[PDB]
């Protein structure tokens, strides 16, 4: 409420004055305008903070606010004399001063629209779900074993390898060069996907892709650091909606290019790289904040962390988040290989993986809109809902496991959409029940450490199940083992629910 909220209530009072008639009672409106104008004259602007005071570039700011308050005087002088038609004159004078004097030293006036446009456009990667048909076609000719047991476990290890140090370098660099490195990493991933002939090329591609997969939390913290806490709720809601709309638009564009447009995979990846270049340009046109999470006190945070470790609900939902997130990430990693294994058809028109991705994103958004409306306390439906939904997920993984019929790929897609709708109903519930306990720095720390535990568990299960130096199990037996693993998890939470 230093300077920007005064301008916000000034714009709100302008909206009160403009579109409303009966200017005999806009005297209160004009005097609130005058109070917000006089309160925002010496309120230490951030652009003026880098400049020294008593400077000739500072006298323009004070002179502009002086002539603005003088125009408020000239408006209220005629507003008190019974003339009700001078409110439009006050609005035109405020428009001229907005064009001339105030906004030159203020910030950008379309930051919400620009952040929503970046969240809509940087998530458009129209060759996302078509990486696995591109790796198993006549263009590159990689087998199922080379993409199953040699490429994607290196993704599983690399997401552990770049989780902690990239985030530790991210929290210090104020989140804009991290997004620049993310855009360069998307450029590197799609160039190694294009210019790649061996297994090591796609291995390095997944190594660069792990950073882009890990920069989500970085982008959310960038939203938190750019936007004031009195503004963060609505802006974060529109930014999350813009990211979800961008992902859905990306999958719909992939279906319209592959199925409807009949675009070949090379031209598809070329247009994907074009949209990545637009994303790199939009990352170049960003605005860097000044504050960060843990680099712009600590004993109080450690005390409030130690005063919540004895909570059984926090540890219970944290361990369930770790196990369910590890299992979900393994299923999402291997489900495209499962889809190309069940239906090994070479026709690109019959490949409907992007349609399953779009339906999964849509049903996840529907179940996430209906997850914040779950105002159920922890006294009655804590463990039973967990056991039932994980039993449903175990049944869906079992249905995906023994699917061997060629024409049952639609049933396989519907089972995956039901699996995504069962998982994405759980994320806002756990996020609400855990995030509303401590401070926001402690919230980010606890969710980051829980993500690190989930990554450890995913790395261990990847080392056990799908490693060539350990057991070396075939992929159908691997999905059967995942089904047995979810069944054991369902039995454990069913015995613990009582």
């Amino acid at each position: 409420a230093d300077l920007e909220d005064n301008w916000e209530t000034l714009n709100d009072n302008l909206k009160v004055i403009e579109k409303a008639d009966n200017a005999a009672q806009v005297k209160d409106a004009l005097t609130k305008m005058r109070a917000a104008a006089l309160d925002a004259q010496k309120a230490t602007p951030p652009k003026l903070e880098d400049k020294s005071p008593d400077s000739p570039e500072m006298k323009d700011f004070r002179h502009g606010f002086d002539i603005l308050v003088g125009q408020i005087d000239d408006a209220l002088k005629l507003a008190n004399e019974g003339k009700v038609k001078e409110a439009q004159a006050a609005a035109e004078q405020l428009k001229t001063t907005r064009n001339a004097y105030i906004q030159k030293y203020l910030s950008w006036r379309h930051l919400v629209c620009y952040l929503c446009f970046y969240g809509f456009m940087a998530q458009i990667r129209p060759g996302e779900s078509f990486i696995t048909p591109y790796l198993l076609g006549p263009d590159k000719n990689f087998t199922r074993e080379q993409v199953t047991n040699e490429i994607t476990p290196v993704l599983s290890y690399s997401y552990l390898a770049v989780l902690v140090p990239v985030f530790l370098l991210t929290d210090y660099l104020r989140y804009t060069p991290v997004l620049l490195l993310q855009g360069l990493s998307f450029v590197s991933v799609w160039l190694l996907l294009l210019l790649g002939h061996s297994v090591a090329h796609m291995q390095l591609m997944e190594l660069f892709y792990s950073v882009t997969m890990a920069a989500r939390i970085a982008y959310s913290s960038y939203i938190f650091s750019l936007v004031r806490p009195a503004r963060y709720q609505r802006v974060a809601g529109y930014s999350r909606a813009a990211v979800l709309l961008g992902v859905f638009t990306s999958s719909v564009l992939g279906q319209l290019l592959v199925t409807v447009g009949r675009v070949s995979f090379s031209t598809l990846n070329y247009i994907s790289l074009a949209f990545l270049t637009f994303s790199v340009v939009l990352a170049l046109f960003l605005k860097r904040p000044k504050r960060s999470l843990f680099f712009n006190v600590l004993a109080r945070m450690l005390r409030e962390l130690g005063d919540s470790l004895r909570r059984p609900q926090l540890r219970l939902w944290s361990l369930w988040w770790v196990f369910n997130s590890a299992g979900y990430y393994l299923v999402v990693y291997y489900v495209h290989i499962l889809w190309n294994e069940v239906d090994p058809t070479t026709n690109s028109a019959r490949v409907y993986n992007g349609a399953a991705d779009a339906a999964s994103t849509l049903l996840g958004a529907i179940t996430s809109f209906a997850a914040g409306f779950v105002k159920i306390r922890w006294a009655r439906w804590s463990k039973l809902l967990i056991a039932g939904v994980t039993a449903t997920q175990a049944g869906l993984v079992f249905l995906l496991a023994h699917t061997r019929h060629p024409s049952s790929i639609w049933l396989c897609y519907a089972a995956f959409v039901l699996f995504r709708g069962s998982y994405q109903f759980l994320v806002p519930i756990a996020t609400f029940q855990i995030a509303s306990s401590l401070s926001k720095e402690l919230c980010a720390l606890v969710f980051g450490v829980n993500t690190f535990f989930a990554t450890i568990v995913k790395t261990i299960i990847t080392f056990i199940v799908s490693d060539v130096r350990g057991l070396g199990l075939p992929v159908r037996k691997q999905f059967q083992l995942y089904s047995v693993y979810f069944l054991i998890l369902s039995i454990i939470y069913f015995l613990g629910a009582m």
Epitope: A35, A36, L38, D66, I67, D73
Partner: antibody, heavy 124, light 109 residues
Framework: EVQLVESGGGLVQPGGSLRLSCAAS????????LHWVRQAPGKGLEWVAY????????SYADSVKGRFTISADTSKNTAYLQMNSLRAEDTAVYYC?????????????????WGQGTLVTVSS | DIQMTQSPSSLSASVGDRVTITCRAS??????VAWYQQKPGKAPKLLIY???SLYSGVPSRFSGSRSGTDFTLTISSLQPEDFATYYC??????????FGQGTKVEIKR
């Protein structure tokens, strides 16, 4: 040095008329505005009216609206507050203080150069 | 129109005591309020202007503060000359000048 002085305040009748005078010796009435401040005996200070000789902005209080009138002449260097149809509430002490124009330091300076203060009374 | 309340309406302090006179506003009036000192019978005098500055002419034993819409006058050393009635004068526009209530300080006895 500059100062203010008041005149024209004595005893009147309820419903009668009375005119005030605020002779601003020294400074002009076009570079600064003039005001009127009321103090009831036993109560505190309160505001009545003002006039700006630059353009004319005669705006009154809620208790004196439609009953009093004000006039300022830039040649005689004074201010008049002509009153009529007075009531028993007007038995008070009237002041006349300087207060400058926007912008600058003379606006942020409040009523700094007051007057001696005249005494009016209304009784039958 | 707007109001300007002033709570400690009856204070009492000896020579060499610190007093606080708060003044709560109704609306979100900016840093523009004044403080007066009226002896019984005489004229008011400007003491503090713009809620923090000291008027040219009065001694430096007076000050002020600003906490949102709560303005507070403080006195370091209470001179026996400083026993009068202190008023709270907010000024935002020409025709919105409303005063306070007045605090009459007394000698502690």
């Amino acid at each position: 040095e500059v100062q203010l002085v008041e005149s024209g305040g004595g005893l009147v009748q309820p419903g009668g008329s009375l005119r005030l005078s605020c002779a601003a010796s020294g400074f002009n009435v076009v570079d600064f505005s003039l005001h009127w401040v009321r103090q009831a005996p036993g109560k505190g200070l309160e505001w009545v009216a003002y006039i700006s000789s630059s353009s004319g902005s005669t705006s009154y209080a809620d208790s004196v609206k439609g009953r009093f009138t004000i006039s300022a002449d830039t040649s005689k260097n004074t201010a008049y507050l002509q009153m009529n149809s007075l009531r028993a509430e007007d038995t008070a002490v009237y002041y006349c203080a300087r207060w400058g124009y926007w912008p600058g330091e003379p606006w942020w300076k409040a009523f700094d150069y007051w007057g001696q203060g005249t005494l009016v009374t209304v009784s039958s | 129109d707007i109001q300007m309340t002033q709570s400690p309406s009856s204070l009492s302090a000896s020579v060499g005591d610190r007093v606080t006179i708060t003044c709560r506003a109704s609306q979100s009036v900016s840093s523009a309020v004044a403080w007066y000192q009226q002896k019984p019978g005489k004229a008011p005098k400007l003491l503090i202007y713009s809620a923090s500055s000291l008027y040219s002419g009065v001694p430096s034993r007076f000050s002020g503060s600003r906490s949102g819409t709560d303005f507070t006058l403080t006195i370091s050393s209470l001179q026996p000359e400083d026993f009068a009635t202190y008023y709270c004068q907010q000024y935002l526009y020409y025709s919105l000048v409303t005063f306070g209530q007045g605090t009459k300080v007394e000698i502690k006895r």
